[PDB]
Amino acid sequence: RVYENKEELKSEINKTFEKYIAEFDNIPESLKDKRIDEVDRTPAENLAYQVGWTTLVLKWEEDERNGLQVKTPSDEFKWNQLGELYQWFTDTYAYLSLQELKSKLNENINSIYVMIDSLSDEELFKPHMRKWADDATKTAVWEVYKFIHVNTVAPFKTFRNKIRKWKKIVL
């Protein structure tokens, strides 16, 4: 999706995040690690995936501003190693409760609003304004807002569909 301005991007993040996070309210902690064949991840893994990617995007931006060399997706994993990165997200966050994961994700979304407001329009909406954005997709050219959309709005919709499917079968 193309966004015309900062307020449009922030609004869509807020709208899709609120719908996504609300789906976890009715899931008891005792079932946060329950896997079924019909849906890929557990509820805790579903949240951990979002905490994982939002933490990384925020870190790329912070490190680049801090004058560090950003290796994307991370220092330990390459772009053809995402499956292993996802296992690392699960190992690193999924042992948390749903309440703790929701709180952490909410903090990252608030930080993403600050990240957006701290960028100039040019830095947010034009190519080649961040080294980490050029580094994260070397086959194509992606603007910062596109990385934000693809790591918030898009998965907040698709992973919402997963958790709803999971809830209909399990609860």
Numbering used by the authors: 13 to 183
Give verbatim lines from the article.
The precursor PdDfsB is cleaved by subtilisin to yield biologically active Slf, and the chemical gradients of both proteins between two growing colonies could be accurately modelled. However, remarkably, the dfsB gene is widely distributed across Gram-positive and to some extent Gram-negative bacterial kingdoms (PFAM entry DUF1706). PdDfsB adopts a four-helical bundle core structure that belongs to the DinB structural superfamily. The most strongly conserved region of PdDfsB is the C-terminal helix, which is present within the mature Slf sequence.
We were able to express, purify and obtain crystal structures for DfsB homologues from Clostridium difficile 630 and Escherichia coli UTI89, as well as of IRC4 from S. cerevisiae. For the purposes of clarity, we refer to the first two proteins as CdDfsB and EcDfsB, respectively; however, we have no evidence that they are truly acting as DfsB homologues by undergoing cleavage and release of their analogous Slf “toxin”. The overall structures of CdDfsB, EcDfsB and IRC4 are identical with that of PdDfsB, with strong conservation of overall topology and surface charge, particularly in the C-terminal helix. We solved the crystal structure of a S. agalactiae DfsB dimer (SaDfsB) by molecular replacement using a pruned CdDfsB structure as the search model.
